[PDB]
Amino acid sequence: KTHVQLSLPVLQVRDVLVRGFGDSVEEVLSEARQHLKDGTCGLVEVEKGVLPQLEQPYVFIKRSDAAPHGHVMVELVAELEGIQYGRSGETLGVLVPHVGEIPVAYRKVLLRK
């Protein structure tokens, strides 16, 4: 399927144990997609002071359209030293590995895969 319904655990930035997906734009997009497929991907909501507490390159989920069955359609955009790889809508948050952190909420998304 071109899209997959996912429910992403929303993590507090100070709880996150693994603060990024790797060391290159291509690696972090690769790893983010693998973790999204494996159900091992968390979401951190972006506010003042969040991104400097995480590791670049960043992987964002961004709204790709204006929401089937409650799931917002999203796609992945990576960022490294202020350059983004991808073009999409509003940021819903930054993706990180999930390794058992307790979430504060869930974000229902339809991921363009």
From Swiss-Prot:
Cellular localization per UniProt: Host cytoplasm
Top-level taxon: Viruses
Residue span(s) of domain CoV Nsp1 globular: 2-113
Region Disordered: start-end pairs: 1-113
Function comment: Inhibits host translation by associating with the open head conformation of the 40S subunit. The C-terminus binds to and obstructs ribosomal mRNA entry tunnel. Thereby inhibits antiviral response triggered by innate immunity or interferons. The nsp1-40S ribosome complex further induces an endonucleolytic cleavage near the 5'UTR of host mRNAs, targeting them for degradation. This inhibits the integrated stress response (ISR) in the infected cell by preventing EIF2S1/eIF2-alpha phosphorylation upstream of stress granule formation and depletes host G3BP1.
The protein's name: Host translation inhibitor nsp1
Taxonomic classification: Viruses, Riboviria, Orthornavirae, Pisuviricota, Pisoniviricetes
